[PDB]
């Protein structure tokens, strides 16, 4: 209800909780380009991974 991703809050997952986009040639702008969220942290998670399901309930 905003929408200004300044941050890597669409890509702040814990890596447990990634949905892998699925990308051949993922990268901290192609894989971002190409549409969806990147990440180098690790390899054994998606480092390519949908944007985390922005939510908010309490705490």
Do not use: L, S
């Given at each position: 209800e905003e929408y200004v991703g300044l941050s890597?809050?669409?890509?702040?997952?814990?890596?447990?909780?990634?949905?892998?986009?699925?990308?051949?040639?993922?990268?901290?702008?192609?894989?971002?380009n190409r549409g969806c969220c990147f990440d180098s942290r690790i390899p054994g998670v998606p480092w390519c991974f949908k944007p985390l399901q922005e939510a908010e309930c309490t705490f």
């Open positions: 890597a809050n669409q890509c702040a997952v814990p890596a447990k909780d990634r949905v892998d986009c699925g990308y051949p040639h993922v990268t901290p702008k192609e894989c971002n």
